[PDB]
């Protein structure tokens, strides 16, 4: 049987998100892409460096906002800019969010040598697409 | 297939459409009206509406083709028809006044008759009964015996007994023999008829 | 209750039992009205009426059911096949088909008088018929043709020896 990126059915008590409920054969039919850049286009270059930056960002943000991320990130590149769009929870205090936004935006700008901006969208609870 | 079940096979007959409406029967008339609504497949390249089209010679050519080389198989077919034609003209000029009336020079008439003299009436089927096989005579359908005549003619020519002899000259020689009820292909048909007669008592082993 | 997980079987059986409730009649709200003796399939249950303070001296399952019903004092002996499901289905069967003192009076139109050794010969009327009281008495029977139980007759004659009967046990 196939296993990649599939959430196995259960009794019915397990909540899943939209992206987590669709398998790889829906990535261009019912889902989009979590990262958007030009590396993988025909005739373009530096697709390998853009991938290592993505892998590091998803981990930097998972450990920098522990227990706060409601769903996967959405990385966007428009020229020199790098826009990180995240959906976070409302448990943490806003004072601590503004601290981490300025700490991460700055640390990542000096690391990758690019202007970085972070966009948060708070939700009360993790959105549920269905129950498996 | 890339066609749906709705698609119907085409009718290349050219004299069928020309039939006047007065001749159309109630059933035939209904059929023509129906075809207008149905979808039709695209005619293949093999068959056209020409007057020289021979479906039996087109099938025999396809049974000789090897690896999709239809240009070569058709070349061998026409060479054989030409060789059979020239051999009869050489036998027609050197014949007596009254012997020229019984010499067929049309290669097609010879090709159809030669194959008809090789068609077997009955065949054999291995029926498993009591951990043994038996050659039970069976009535062959009209298609089966038409296919066997072609396959035996092509197999005999492809035999290795003939050394550095080209296919058009080999096939042409067999067609004349068969046309005269001679040669090995005919003997193969007779042997099948002799093995079915010896195993006639085994006819009851057949249930269909 | 049946299920694959044990926690799910407890719910089904628990929530489904309140929809199949019986009503058990009790004599003075502490015991049964009369001695019962039935057989459900292969399981024999011989319950006996006892006075106040006797306690529950019966199969541990019956002790647990009786507390739910409200029977404080009763004796029972189980024989044959000790199957918890036939034992339970038969217990509820005999406890629901027991005739009270009021039904008996109405049935025969006579007074039901209670005789107690502690109260001497005083006749205590526990139930009387609502309808017309009969004027003729029941025909006294010289010898009753009632089937007896060798186990009870053998005990009354000081013949049932057992090193397991009448043992000191905890309160029930």
């Amino acid at each position: 049987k196939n296993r990649a990126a599939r959430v196995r059915v259960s009794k019915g008590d397990k909540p899943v998100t939209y992206e987590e409920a669709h398998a790889p054969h829906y990535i261009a039919h019912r889902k989009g892409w979590l990262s958007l850049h030009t590396g993988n286009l025909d005739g373009e270059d530096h697709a390998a460096e853009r991938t290592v930056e993505d892998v590091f960002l998803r981990k930097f943000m998972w450990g920098t906002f522990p227990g706060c991320l409601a769903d996967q990130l959405v990385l966007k590149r428009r020229g020199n800019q790098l826009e990180i769009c995240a959906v976070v929870l409302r448990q943490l205090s806003p004072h601590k969010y503004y601290f981490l936004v300025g700490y991460s935006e700055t640390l990542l700008s000096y690391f990758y040598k690019c202007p970085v901006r972070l966009h948060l969208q708070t939700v009360p609870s993790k959105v549920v697409y269905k129950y498996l | 297939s890339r066609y749906s079940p709705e698609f119907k096979d085409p009718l290349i007959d050219k004299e069928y459409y020309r039939k006047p409406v007065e001749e159309l029967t109630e059933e035939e008339k209904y059929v023509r009206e129906l075809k207008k609504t149905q979808l039709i497949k695209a005619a293949p390249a093999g068959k056209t509406s020409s007057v020289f089209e021979d479906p039996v010679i087109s099938k025999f050519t396809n049974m000789m083709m090897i690896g999709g080389n239809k240009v070569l198989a058709r070349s061998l077919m026409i060479q054989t028809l030409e060789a059979v034609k020239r051999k009869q003209f050489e036998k027609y000029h050197a014949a007596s006044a009254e012997e020229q009336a019984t010499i067929e020079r049309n290669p097609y008439t010879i090709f159809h008759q030669a194959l008809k003299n090789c068609e077997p009436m009955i065949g054999l089927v291995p029926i498993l009964k009591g951990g043994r096989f038996y050659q039970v005579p069976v009535p062959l359908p009209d298609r089966r015996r038409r296919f066997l005549a072609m396959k035996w003619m092509i197999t005999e020519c492809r035999d290795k007994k003939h050394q550095r002899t080209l296919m058009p000259e080999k096939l042409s020689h067999k067609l004349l023999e068969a046309f005269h009820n001679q040669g090995p292909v005919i003997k193969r048909k007779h042997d099948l008829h002799k093995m079915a007669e010896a195993n006639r008592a085994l006819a009851h082993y057949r249930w269909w | 209750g049946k299920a694959t997980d044990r926690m799910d079987a407890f719910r089904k059986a628990k929530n489904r039992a309140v929809h199949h409730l019986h009503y058990i009649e009790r004599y003075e709200d502490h015991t049964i009205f009369h001695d019962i003796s039935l057989r459900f399939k292969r399981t024999h249950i011989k319950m006996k009426k006892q006075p106040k303070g006797y306690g529950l001296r019966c199969h541990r399952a019956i002790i647990t059911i009786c507390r739910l019903i409200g029977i404080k004092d009763m004796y029972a002996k189980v024989s044959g096949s000790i199957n918890m499901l036939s034992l339970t289905q038969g217990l509820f069967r005999g406890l629901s088909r027991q005739e009270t003192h009021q039904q008996l009076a109405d049935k025969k139109g006579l007074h039901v008088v209670e005789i107690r050794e502690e109260c001497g010969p005083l006749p205590i009327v526990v139930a009387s018929p609502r309808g017309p009281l009969r004027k003729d008495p029941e025909p006294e029977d010289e010898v009753p043709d009632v089937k007896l139980d060798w186990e009870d007759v053998k005990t009354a004659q000081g013949m049932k020896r057992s090193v397991w009967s009448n043992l000191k046990r905890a309160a029930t």
Binding site: - | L11, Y17, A43 | -
Partner: protein, 312 residues
């Protein structure tokens, strides 16, 4: 579950959002139809997902949320319908009405139309139905038609019939054109495998054909290929009456002939009668051949062949 009050609040957000969307695009909020909403949502939120049911959508709540049955009992608790306890009060109230109209008839005495399908009947009744239930109801309707039904009955039966758009299998004739000299001709296109051909058929000619500027017998040495070019004209008895000038590109030897055969036939339909065009269609001269090369699969030697299988 979605209540009536919830739907009423969704109707108010769509109406207000419909006026915002018109203010963005610079249109008139009054004359802003639903076709303009779909065009503006595809520009502002461009999604190329292959599934159109997974793209951003801003429609009317009456087309998004599924239709739901109204409450069937009041405060006191008595249902509103006498066939409520059946569970199918709508399906059986219909069967009760139809069977009541069949009793009255006894006392006082299709091409485009298709019977309603099962899935379309559930929406009308807002009830879930089985297959055998659908067949029983359809049998009463047919029985209703056979009898001398009155005018009022016909209107009822037409609520459960749906029109059908009957396609026409009639070839489309090309417009005859005229050149500078004044000669009439017709142009068409053919396609066989990867070969693509454009053919120009003149109304009057001496049976001359030129492929890519070369006479046909030189361009197609093989006889079989020339037979294909002859099939369209021979079938309609027009050999030596037209002049053809075509240009084929791509494909192989035999695919270019079949592609030209199809184009010549399509362009030859303008200089023949309708009855002949129908005969050409029933002979397979106007149909594009869909048989194309099939792809090879991983784990296989070919499109359909498999690797040699070893049992042990």
């Amino acid at each position: 579950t979605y209540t009536e009050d919830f739907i009423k609040k969704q109707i108010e957000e769509f109406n207000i959002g419909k006026r915002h969307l018109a203010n963005m695009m610079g249109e008139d909020p009054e004359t802003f139809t639903q076709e303009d909403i779909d065009r503006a949502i595809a520009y502002l939120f461009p999604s190329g997902l292959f599934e159109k049911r997974a793209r951003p959508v801003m429609k009317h709540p009456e087309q998004i949320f599924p239709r739901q049955r109204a409450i069937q009992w009041g405060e006191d608790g008595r249902p509103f319908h006498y066939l409520f306890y059946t569970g199918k009060q709508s399906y059986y109230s219909l069967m009760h009405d139809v069977y009541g109209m069949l009793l009255n008839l006894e006392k006082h005495q299709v091409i485009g139309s298709r019977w309603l399908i099962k899935e379309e009947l559930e929406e009308m009744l807002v009830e879930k139905l089985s297959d055998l239930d659908y067949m029983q109801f359809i049998r009463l309707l047919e029985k209703l038609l056979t009898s001398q039904c009155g005018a009022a009955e016909e209107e009822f039966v037409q609520r459960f019939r749906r029109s059908v758009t009957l396609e026409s299998k009639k070839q489309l004739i090309e417009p005859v054109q005229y050149d500078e000299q004044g000669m009439a001709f017709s142009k068409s296109e053919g396609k066989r495998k990867t070969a693509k051909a454009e053919a120009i058929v003149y109304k009057h000619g001496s049976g001359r054909i030129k492929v890519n500027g070369i006479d046909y017998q030189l361009y197609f040495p093989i006889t079989q290929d020339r037979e294909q070019l002859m099939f369209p004209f021979h079938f309609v008895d027009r050999l030596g009456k037209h002049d053809v000038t075509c240009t084929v590109s791509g494909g192989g030897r035999s695919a270019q002939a079949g592609a030209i055969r199809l184009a010549m036939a399509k362009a030859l339909c303008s200089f023949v009668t309708e009855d002949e065009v129908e005969w050409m269609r029933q002979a397979g001269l106007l149909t594009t051949d869909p048989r194309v090369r099939e792809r090879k699969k991983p784990g296989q030697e070919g499109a359909r062949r498999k690797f040699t299988w070893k049992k042990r």
